[PDB]
Amino acid sequence: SGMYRNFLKRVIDILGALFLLILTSPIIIATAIFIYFKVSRDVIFTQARPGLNEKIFKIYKFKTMSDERDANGELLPDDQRLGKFGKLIRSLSLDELPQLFNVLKGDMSFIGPRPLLVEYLPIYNETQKHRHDVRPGITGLAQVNGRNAISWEKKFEYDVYYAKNLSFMLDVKIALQTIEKVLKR
């Protein structure tokens, strides 16, 4: 290919992220306000993950757990630092919204491999390393093919096949498989 792989896919990523950022902007400001006054005035925390050509970038996400400490300082267990409304924000995936800015700025695509830990970079073999030949995605070929089994090698098989055979057909197929995925629980 080339015409869609090297150009048109990025435009849909930019416009889509820009449209969705303006579309959910009241919810974004509302979420940040609640977190500011009841969780943490830092609101946003970043996540360093490998991306295109394995280059590290920070993933933006809303902070949901408090920054509470202990009499000795070792933080409370995760049970007591995550209130009911924090779980509600997590449940509605509102904390995930800042990643639209990641998609907009080029860190990620709308459809692509899942951003995983930096630890796995030396573990990937010569075939699985190719999953970083494309930008990571909010959804992708591996996310829609979940079969209640943790076969990392088969997830990586889907990842490598996607990076090699990126098509406008395939992207539409993933998009339909993603909305049909959410029609179920």
Numbering used by the authors: -1 to 183
The authors write:
In the current study, further insight is derived from the structure of selenomethionine (SeMet)-derivatized PglC co-crystallized with UDP. UDP was utilized in co-crystallization, as it significantly stabilized this PGT as shown by nanoscale differential scanning fluorimetry (nanoDSF). In contrast to I57M/Q175M PglC, the SeMet PglC has an asymmetric unit (ASU) comprising eight monomers rather than two per unit cell, allowing independent refinement. Although the resolution was low (3.01 Å), and the ligand was not stoichiometrically bound (10–20% occupancy of any ligand to the active site), it was possible to make correlations between the presence or absence of electron density and the loop conformations. In monomers G and H, which are closed, as well as A and B (intermediate conformation), a comparatively large number of electrons is present in the site where the nucleotide would be expected to bind. In contrast, monomers C, D, E, and F, which are open, all have significantly fewer electrons present. Analysis of the mobile loop in the context of active-site ligand occupancy shows that chains with a greater positive electron density were in a more closed conformation than those with little or no density. Monomers occupying the same position within each of the four lattice dimers do not always occupy the same mobile loop position; thus, the difference in the observed loop conformation is likely due to differential binding at the active site.
pmcPhosphoglycosyl transferases (PGTs) catalyze the transfer of a phosphosugar group from a UDP-sugar substrate to a membrane-resident polyprenol phosphate (most commonly in bacteria undecaprenol or decaprenol phosphate) acceptor. Catalysis proceeds via a covalent intermediate with both soluble and amphiphilic substrates remaining in aqueous and membrane environments, respectively.
